[PDB]
Structure formats: structure tokens, C-alpha cells
């Protein structure tokens, strides 16, 4: 918004959710809240200007990414931005508010891939090639699954600390340390005032770019009443603030429960009570690897996504936070195999995949190190746009004066008659 | 319009933005449309709440209307399920869709595009398509509907695959000692005739043994009167055939140009060998989807092989209806049946009774048009078993969910997930 016009949209998402308990009724129409960022521009839009399709991390409002968009435009070299499109996942942020009477206690990351495919088809007239995907965290997983759904859709992908790995998270089982997931279930989720909520959440905002701070305090917290906290006076009574009629309690805009059921999924029925043996229940958990069913929580998408990486068609930049809490070593094995097999870009051996590990940077680097994250993206984009322009030109040259109606002469040389 | 048992509604709906192969259209941003027929039973009573929405896909160059007698038979013989409606689209490059798109089509075809076209169609008509949905695919349509199930695992309750093109081996293409196949025939075949009566006789192989109801639809839909883009000059063709004096005959051509059948049956692989080493080097700009193991010949078809390799992940239950006297690699198909749904994402497959093969001795690739009543009967037996399972699993789901909050997680979460140490 330093550099862009913002257009808001509310678009219907994918019919029939991957998990039946993700909505109140299985036919519910979830909507996604989209912001479209169009650069303020005197001249006409260049013909190869990029359409960016961006996805956020769990519980992170799309508006937090606006400084990154400003930096991408400010530092753009050898490419133009037609527009950046970022949607809130249906169960989170502004989308979750719009869908609040239809949401329920489940979440598949795959649904947002289908929601985005629908969005792109809805706005196709404003989204000519080239398209580029950007995904942060579970958004990195989602944008990769969109590339699996539609291999030639994206020219390239920009993954920012993507949740693509094999190993389950730490969940405090046995000797394991409780993780952000344990924290999410048990965390405070309501405060007597926005001022108290902001002070109580100093940790998540430490190191944030000042431009992100204002967006965080506005979007991360929501005034009561909400469906989870429908009674303002009952919460003032809980905090003993009833006498202050001027102040409104706030809650997490994305309920902690909607963060939680995106971070991890219940596996409460995997063990035969007689044999003690794991038997995957296919009615509810067909997508669960029996090897991860040993604990009563799982997350299928990081592992399924990792195992399909050799098929990833677009070129792919993996920007990894050196101080991430994700399994950095598994992520780097993902980089190595990415695009190397059938359907694939050609991967690291063809120079179609690169890792940049940013030492000392954390998971929230898109809000803490906006300029360096943008710079890393721009270097890759200028190389990929050079390759795009050359391969597009060579395509047109090779197609020049070929028929649209009948096959070329070589067919009659290779395929014998009867 | 009407079949024996159904109201027909026609639709023209935009397909998927950006085609899998750039040469499948004149311009890469072209908006292809799919011509859809929606078949709604003529019905006295209200529509039951579990009535099935069928999404159907055809074989290469086979007009959707050929499937209408099969739809009539499904409805006439339906037992233990109701039909909400049957929806069948023509693939963008074929049949009525190809006519609508004729100025935008070009010489390439990915089967994966029709899977995305159908996903868009279902979302467009979602208000008329509550669960349960069931997929039906014939031949390359069997491949397509399976890839739709890969795109959206929980979309279909079950799939009905009629001689699906899912196997590992390339087709026979007359290389070396190999017999030429229907693919060789497709490139070289006559594709224009002085009259529809002559065109019917020239096409007798594809029509032999057809049910009379399918024959009438074939003679109406398989041929198109000139002019067309490929044959834009009626008088030039009457001159070629010596029928200029005869005002009573109009030349006809294939409704689906032979070239659009051909580029669906097989894809050029004209640049797979390093000219220096003679070694196969898959060119990733054009052939990223090509297995180097099938790149030894200058033609390939990726989708049967990719689809086969993902079968263990197929979520819906799956009926494999195989023609006795099919042109498919029947032994590879039977290995596909064995693994179908057996892995991660999968139904549970043959060991859980979620996958069944019915190989009908002596039947033919075109069995959906030649043995309509028996094909319908095979489908109905499977559908009644699957709908019993659907009703039971839906009831058990509702029962298990009955106590539960939509807003907050159940108590068990606080038992399994310990708090952070204070
Ligand atoms: C402990 O961190 C993990 C790890 C290692 C894994 C998963 C997971 O959910 C979390 C919590 C995810 C968080 C806090 C934010 C994600 C985002 O910003 O999108 C998982 O699913 O497999 C591996
Ligand atoms: C000779 O038949 C084959 C075989 C065996 C294979 C393929 C193929 O394209 C054809 C021709 C395809 C047709 C006739 C389409 C049929 C339809 O869809 O009704 C393939 O890709 O692997 C195996």
C-alpha cells in the first residue's frame, strides 16, 4: 500500500472439503477474502508482467505481507509486477470471520490449493502468463500442492520456510519438548482490552518491521462478541472489568482452535484396543502413513508433499530460515530431490532449484527481515524471467507457420500406414 | 430434448485457465468451453436426499450422446439408489465442444486438462450437485475421471471405469515388427465423404455390433456437413468426388477431426535423442512428463503410465469393467486393479472389498454401445453395494459427531497434548 492500489474480493471456494468435519454441513460454500495489489503506474502494463499468487502461514493475516510486497516492487529489476493476489485461508484471518457460522473443527491444507485454482479461473482475464507462486510456511506446502494440481500454471515458485518434511513435529510425547503446537492448544485467547492483548503478545512482535507492527495489532485481535466469545459482559465479569463500560475485550481473530487443527490433526482411533496394533481407519484417515500413526496426532501434507517433490514442474527457490524450528535437514533433502524425476523441472542438476539458507533468520523472517527476503526473491526472479523470455521466444519461433488444423509432415514419416 | 427416461439441459461452461501443453490452443490464454448435457430423470416423487450425481467422461472421438442408452438402462434398472442427474461433457477438442472451440484449438492435447475442466464444471453447478457424486469414465475418460479423483480425493463416493486407459506399456504403433494399431489408422484414415450415407459405410468398423439407439446417435453426431475449418470449400470437395451436378448430396467430414483424435491418442516425441551421443535426454521444456524408459520411440502417451503409478493412492472405491476382447494391455490392467487404493490416500483396495474387476468375456472396447443392458447391470450391482456402505458410513459419521462443538476442540486434545512447562 506504499506502492499499490488494493482491491478486496470475496470468492467462493472449492465444493466438498477434503475432511467432512471442516464445516457444519458438507455442501457449505466457504469464501476466501482476497486482496489484489496493483502497482500505481503511469505507463501501460508490460506484456510479461508477473501475476503473483501468495499464501500465508497459519494464523498470519495476509496484510502482514504488505511490506514484503512493497519491497518486491521497490527492488524489482528485469521484471514487472502485474499484481500480487493473497487470500486468507477459509478458516483463518478475514476469511474465517466471513465463514464463522460454517466452520468446524478440521482443516485440510489441500482445500486452499483447490480454492486458489478456482480464484485464478475466476480472475483469469487479469492473470495472463506468467504466474509465480509465493508460499510462507504451510502456505509453502499449499502453493506446491497447487503446482501438483496444475503443473504448467506457475513459471516458478518462491517458498519461504515451507512446511515440507517427513518427520512429525515435536508434541511433548515422552521426553520430547512441548512445541508451538502444545502452546497453541493451551494459550490465553481472550484479554480484557486490545492494549492488554498487545502487551501479552510482545514475544510474537519482537523484531517485527515497524510496518508489520500496526497490521499485527489491528488484524491479530478481534473485538468481542465472536461465536467463541458471544457474551461481552460475561468476559468483563471473568476479568472483573464490569465497571469500565468503555473498553471491549478482544480475542484471537483466528481462534487458537483453527490454528491448532491446521498445525496438526487428531489420530484418536489408530490402535486396535485388543492387539494394540496400528490399523489405519480408512473412513477418516486414509491419508495417514501407518509409520506416523504411532502417536494420536499427525499431519499428512508435509510428508505426502515431500514424497512428490521429484514431480514438481515449476523451477523452485527454497528460502530457509537458518534458525527455523522446522526440520531444516529434511527440508534440504527436499531441495535436493525437487524436480529431479518424471514431471519435474530438472531440479538442482539443471539449475532449476536453489536453496538460500539465511543464517540467524527465524520462521517470521517475511515480517522481521523484509528487505533481505525481498532481495533473495528478486535475484531468483530476474534469472527465471530471463529464461522465461528466451524459452517463450524459442517456442514462438519453433511454432511459426505450423498449422493449427492438421499435424506436421514428420507424423507420416514415423507412423506407418495400413 | 429427451432420452427415454430424462429431461436434457445443454450448457456451455468455460474450462481450465492455461492448458497443460502450450500448443493445445492458438493463444495460451484462450478460454476453451465444454458442451455439457445434464440428464434429469422425469420423476413423480421428490428427489431423495442421497440421490447420486454422476459425472461421466467419453472415449476419444466418441460423442457424449452415444452414452444416452446406457443412461436410460442405468435409470430403468436402478435398485437401492436414486439418480439426481447424469452430467457428461464433450472434451474441449472433440465432439460438440470442438465445434464451439474450432477457432481456438491447435495440434496438442493433455488428458489432464479435462480433469480440471470437470472440477470447474462441478464448482459451477455445485448447488445441483450435493453428495454423493459418482464418476464414470470410458477409455481415456476412465483415465481422466481417475485423475479428477487424484485432484480431489473425497469428491467421488465411487468410480465406474469402463475399459480405462490406465497401463504402463506404450500402444502398438507399427514400429519394427509390431502391428499398426487404431493410432496408425487414425493418422492415415479418409476423413471426408461425398454424402453421410457414404461416410457411414466407410466407418462400419467403429459401428459394428452397436445397439440401434447408439447407431442413430453415431450417424447424427460422428459426421458434420461441410463447410468446416479443415474443409471450408463445399464446391471444391463436390468437384473432387465428381458430385457437382447432384444438388441432393452434401459432403460430410469427421465431427472430431482425425488430427484431434490422433493428438489425444498419442503425442510427438520428435526430439528425445542427443544427436552426438545418440543417448535419450528428455527435453524438460516440452517433455518433462515423459518417462525416459518410453522415450526410445518418437511417440508417447504419458497419462496411462503416470495414472497407473499413482493407483495405490486412489481414494474412491473403484469398479473396473473390462471388455473381453479389449485392445488394452489386460494383464497390466489386472496388476493395476490389485494395487488400486492399497496405499496412502487409498480406499483400502481389493483386501477391503473397495476394488472389483468384472472382465466380461468376448465384449469389445465399445461395450458401452454394444452390450448396453449388461454394462448397466454390472454398474447397478456395484452401485447398490456402494450406496448401502455410503448410507451406513454417513449415519455413523453423524452419530460420532453428535455431541461435538464446531468452535473448540474436544476434551481428548487436553489429555494427549501436554502444556508448555511454566
Ligand atoms: C513445530 O512446528 C511444526 C513442525 C516442525 C511440523 C508441523 C507443524 O504443524 C508445526 C507447527 C506449525 C507452526 C507453529 C506454524 C506453521 C505456519 O506458520 O504455517 C507439521 O505439520 O509437520 C512438521
Ligand atoms: C491402440 O489403443 C491404445 C492403447 C493400447 C494405449 C494408448 C492409446 O492412446 C491407444 C489408442 C487410444 C484410443 C483408441 C482411445 C480409446 C478411447 O479413449 O476410446 C496409450 O496411451 O497406452 C496404451
> Which element (helix H / strand E) includes A251?
strand A250-252
Whether residue B30 contacts residue B105, with contact meaning beta carbons closer than 8 Å, is answered with no
Experimental approach was X-ray
Q: Residue written as cell 463445399?
A: B234
φ, ψ at B302 (rounded to 5°): -75, -35
How far is the alpha carbon of A2 from chain B, nearest alpha carbon, in Å? 31
Which residues in chain B touch residue A304, judged by CB atoms under 8 angstroms apart? 344-345
What nine digits make up the cell of B410? Answer: 474436544
Q: Which domains does chain B have, with CATH numbers?
A: 6-168+305-399 (3.40.50.1820), 267-294 (no CATH)
Chain A, 339 to 398: residues with Cβ < 8 Å from chain B are 342-346, 350, 352, 391, 394-395
What nine digits make up the cell of B390? Answer: 455410503
What nine digits make up the cell of B111? Answer: 488428458
Which neighbouring-strand residues pair with A136? A160
Chain A, 285 to 304: residues with Cβ < 8 Å from chain B are 286-289, 296-297, 300, 304
Resolution of this model in Å is: 1.8
HEC secondary structure over chain B: CECCCEEEEEEEEECCCCCCCHHHECCCCCCCEEEEEEEEECCCCCCCCCCEEEEEECCCCCCHHHHHHHHHHHHHHCCCCCEEEEEEECCCCCHHHHHHCCCCECCCCCHHHHHHHHHHHHHHCHHHCCCCEEEEEECHHHHHHHHHHHHCCCCEEEEEEECCCCCCCCCCCCCCCCCCCHHHHHHHCCCEECCHHHHHHHCHHHHCCCCHHHHHHHHHHCEEECCCCCCCCHHHHHHHHCCCCCCCCCCEEECCCHHHHHHHHCEECCCCECCCCCCECCCHHHHCCCCHHHCCCCEECHHHHHHHHCHHHCCCEEEEEEECCCCCCHHHHHHHHHHCCCCCCCCCCHHHCCEEEEEECCCCCCHHHHCHHHHHHHHHHHHHHHHHHHHHHHHHHHHHHCCCCCCCCCCHHHHHCCCCCC
d(CA B233, CA B250): 11
Cα A79 from chain centre: 23
d(CA A155, CA A389): 11
Q: Using alpha carbons, select from B96, B151, B81 the residue that is nearest to residue B122.
A: B151
Decide if A178 and B419 are in contact by the 8 Å CB cutoff: yes
> What is the strand order of the sheet B52-57 is part of?
B6-14, B33-41, B83-89, B52-57, B133-138, B156-162, B317-323, B355-360
Decide if A178 and B154 are in contact by the 8 Å CB cutoff: no
Decide if A127 and B416 are in contact by the 8 Å CB cutoff: no
Within 8 A by CB and 6+ apart from A177, the residues are A170
d(CA A418, CA A401): 29
**Helix intervals (H) in A23-124:** 66-75, 93-98, 109-122
φ, ψ at B157 (rounded to 5°): -70, -40
How far is the alpha carbon of A269 from chain B, nearest alpha carbon, in Å? 12
Compare CB distances from A415 to B130, B184, B416 and report the shortest one's residue: B184
What nine digits make up the cell of B398? Answer: 453423524
* SS3 (DSSP) at A102: coil
Q: Does ligand 2 have an atom closer than 6 angstroms to the CB of B140?
A: yes
Which residues in chain A touch residue B347, judged by CB atoms under 8 angstroms apart? 282, 286
d(CA B420, CA A182): 6
Q: Counting beta carbons within 10 angstroms of the beta carbon of residue A176, is it exposed (0 to 12), middle (13 to 18) or buried (19 or more)?
A: middle
Which neighbouring-strand residues pair with A53? A85, A133
Handedness of CA B301, B305, B310, B314 (dihedral sign): positive
Whether residue B29 contacts residue B86, with contact meaning beta carbons closer than 8 Å, is answered with no
Cis peptide before B54 (omega within 30 of 0): no
Cα–Cα separations (whole angstroms), residue A399 to A22, A395, B25, B92, B110: 47, 6, 12, 21, 18
* B235-240: long-range contacts, CB 8 A cutoff, minimum separation 24: B237/B192, B237/B194, B238/B194
> Which element (helix H / strand E) includes A11?
strand A4-12
Decide if B230 and A128 are in contact by the 8 Å CB cutoff: no
**Helix intervals (H) in A265-369:** 282-285, 300-307, 328-337, 365-368
Nearest CA in chain B to A171: B417
Decide if B348 and A297 are in contact by the 8 Å CB cutoff: no
What nine digits make up the cell of A197? Answer: 492483548
Residue A348, CA atoms < 13 Å, CB-side half-sphere: 12
Compare CB distances from B184 to A103, A261, A416 and report the shortest one's residue: A416
Query: Beta B252-254 vs B223-225: how paired, if at all?
Result: antiparallel
Whether residue A6 contacts residue A37, with contact meaning beta carbons closer than 8 Å, is answered with yes
Count of Cβ atoms closer than 10 Å to residue A94 Cβ: 22
Whether residue B20 contacts residue A152, with contact meaning beta carbons closer than 8 Å, is answered with yes
Count of Cβ atoms closer than 10 Å to residue B120 Cβ: 19
> Which element (helix H / strand E) includes A222?
strand A221-223
Decide if B184 and A345 are in contact by the 8 Å CB cutoff: no
Q: Does ligand 1 have an atom closer than 6 angstroms to the CB of A302?
A: yes
Count of Cβ atoms closer than 10 Å to residue A28 Cβ: 18
d(CA B87, CA B120): 13
What are the strands, taking DSSP E only, across A50-163?
Answer: 50-55, 81-87, 131-136, 154-160
d(CA A266, CA B412): 9
Cα–Cα separations (whole angstroms), residue B97 to A151, B53, B117, B125, B293: 24, 22, 12, 18, 34
d(CA A172, CA A155): 40
Q: What would you measure as the largest C-alpha separation in chain A, in angstroms?
A: 94
Q: Using alpha carbons, select from B139, B93, B143, B57 the residue that is nearest to residue B262.
A: B93
φ, ψ at B106 (rounded to 5°): -145, -175
Q: Does ligand 2 have an atom closer than 6 angstroms to the CB of B183?
A: yes
Q: How far is the centre of ligand 1, averaged over its atoms, from the C-alpha of A280 (Å)?
A: 23
Q: Does ligand 2 have an atom closer than 6 angstroms to the CB of B328?
A: yes
Nearest CA in chain A to B130: A27
Which residues in chain B touch residue A260, judged by CB atoms under 8 angstroms apart? 409, 413
d(CA B140, CA B415): 50
> Which element (helix H / strand E) includes A379?
helix A370-399
d(CA B143, CA B140): 5
Count of Cβ atoms closer than 10 Å to residue B293 Cβ: 11
Within 8 A by CB and 6+ apart from B50, the residues are B81, B82, B132, B387, B390, B391, B394
Decide if B345 and A391 are in contact by the 8 Å CB cutoff: no
d(CA B134, CA A233): 50
φ, ψ at A150 (rounded to 5°): -150, 75
Count of Cβ atoms closer than 10 Å to residue A46 Cβ: 12
Chain B, 131 to 170: residues with Cβ < 8 Å from chain A are 131, 133, 151-155
φ, ψ at A377 (rounded to 5°): -65, -45
Decide if B152 and A404 are in contact by the 8 Å CB cutoff: no
Question: What region, left, alpha or beta, does residue B247 occupy, with left being phi > 0 and alpha being psi -120 to 50 degrees?
Answer: alpha
What nine digits make up the cell of B156? Answer: 467421488
What nine digits make up the cell of A252? Answer: 484471537
What are the strands, taking DSSP E only, across A291-415?
Answer: 297-298, 315-321, 353-358
Q: Using alpha carbons, select from B56, B54, B53 the residue that is nearest to residue B34.
A: B56
What nine digits make up the cell of A376? Answer: 533473495
Chain A, 26 to 45: residues with Cβ < 8 Å from chain B are 26-27, 29
Within 8 A by CB and 6+ apart from B73, the residues are B372, B373, B375, B376, B377
Decide if A406 and B107 are in contact by the 8 Å CB cutoff: yes
Count of Cβ atoms closer than 10 Å to residue A390 Cβ: 10
Which residues in chain B touch residue A257, judged by CB atoms under 8 angstroms apart? 407-409
Say yes or no: B23 contacts chain A, CB-CB below 8 A.
yes
Q: Using alpha carbons, select from B359, B335, B302 the residue that is nearest to residue A313.
A: B302
How far is the alpha carbon of B272 from chain A, nearest alpha carbon, in Å? 14
φ, ψ at A182 (rounded to 5°): -55, -45
Q: Using alpha carbons, select from B244, B228, B144 the residue that is nearest to residue B194.
A: B244
Query: Beta A265-266 vs A250-252: how paired, if at all?
Result: unpaired
Query: Beta B133-138 vs B156-162: how paired, if at all?
Result: parallel
Within 8 A by CB and 6+ apart from A43, the residues are none
Amino acid at each position: 500500500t506504499e506502492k499499490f492500489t488494493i482491491t478486496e474480493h470475496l470468492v467462493p471456494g472449492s465444493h466438498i472439503r477434503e475432511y467432512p468435519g471442516s464445516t457444519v454441513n458438507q455442501e457449505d460454500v466457504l469464501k476466501i477474502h482476497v486482496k489484489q495489489y496493483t502497482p500505481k503506474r503511469e505507463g501501460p502494463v508490460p506484456d510479461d508482467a508477473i501475476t503473483f499468487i501468495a499464501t500465508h502461514g497459519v494464523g498470519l493475516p495476509k496484510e502482514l505481507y504488505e511490506p514484503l510486497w512493497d519491497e518486491l516492487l521497490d527492488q524489482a529489476s528485469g521484471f514487472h509486477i502485474r499484481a500480487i493476489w493473497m487470500a486468507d485461508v477459509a478458516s483463518m484471518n478475514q476469511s474465517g470471520i466471513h465463514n464463522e457460522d460454517k466452520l468446524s473443527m478440521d482443516c485440510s491444507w489441500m482445500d486452499h490449493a483447490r480454492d486458489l485454482l478456482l480464484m485464478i479461473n475466476h480472475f483469469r482475464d487479469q492473470m495472463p502468463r506468467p504466474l509465480v507462486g509465493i508460499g510462507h510456511a504451510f502456505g509453502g506446502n499449499i502453493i506446491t500442492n497447487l503446482a501438483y494440481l496444475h503443473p504448467r500454471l506457475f513459471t516458478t515458485l518462491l517458498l519461504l520456510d515451507p512446511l515440507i518434511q517427513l518427520s512429525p513435529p515435536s508434541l511433548g510425547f515422552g521426553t520430547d519438548a512441548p512445541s508451538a503446537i502444545n502452546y497453541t492448544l493451551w494459550r490465553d485467547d481472550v484479554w480484557p482490552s486490545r492494549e492488554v492483548a498487545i502487551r501479552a503478545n510482545r514475544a510474537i512482535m519482537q523484531g517485527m518491521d515497524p510496518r508489520c507492527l500496526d497490521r499485527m495489532t489491528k488484524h491479530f485481535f478481534r473485538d468481542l462478541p465472536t461465536p467463541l466469545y458471544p457474551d461481552v459482559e460475561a468476559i468483563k465479569a471473568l476479568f472483573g472489568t464490569t465497571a469500565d463500560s468503555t473498553t471491549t475485550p478482544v480475542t484471537l481473530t483466528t481462534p487458537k482452535y483453527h490454528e491448532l487443527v491446521a498445525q496438526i490433526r487428531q489420530n484418536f482411533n489408530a490402535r486396535d484396543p485388543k492387539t494394540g496394533r496400528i490399523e489405519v481407519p480408512r473412513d477418516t484417515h486414509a491419508d495417514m502413513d501407518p509409520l506416523v500413526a504411532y502417536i494420536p496426532l499427525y499431519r499428512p501434507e508435509p510428508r505426502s508433499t515431500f514424497r512428490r517433490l521429484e514431480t514438481l514442474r515449476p523451477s523452485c527457490l527454497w528460502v530457509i530460515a537458518g534458525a527455523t524450528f522446522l526440520n531444516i535437514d529434511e527440508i534440504r533433502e527436499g531441495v535436493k530431490i525437487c524436480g529431479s524425476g518424471i514431471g519435474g523441472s530438472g531440479g538442482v542438476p539443471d539449475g532449476r532449484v536453489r536453496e538460500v539458507v539465511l543464517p540467524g533468520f527465524g520462521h517470521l523472517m517475511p515480517f522481521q527481515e523484509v528487505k533481505t527476503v525481498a532481495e533473495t526473491c528478486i535475484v531468483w526472479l530476474q534469472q527465471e524471467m530471463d529464461r522465461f523470455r528466451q524459452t517463450e521466444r524459442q517456442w514462438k519461433e519453433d511454432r511459426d507457420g505450423k498449422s493449427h488444423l492438421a499435424v506436421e509432415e514428420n507424423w507420416y514419416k514415423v507412423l506407418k500406414p495400413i
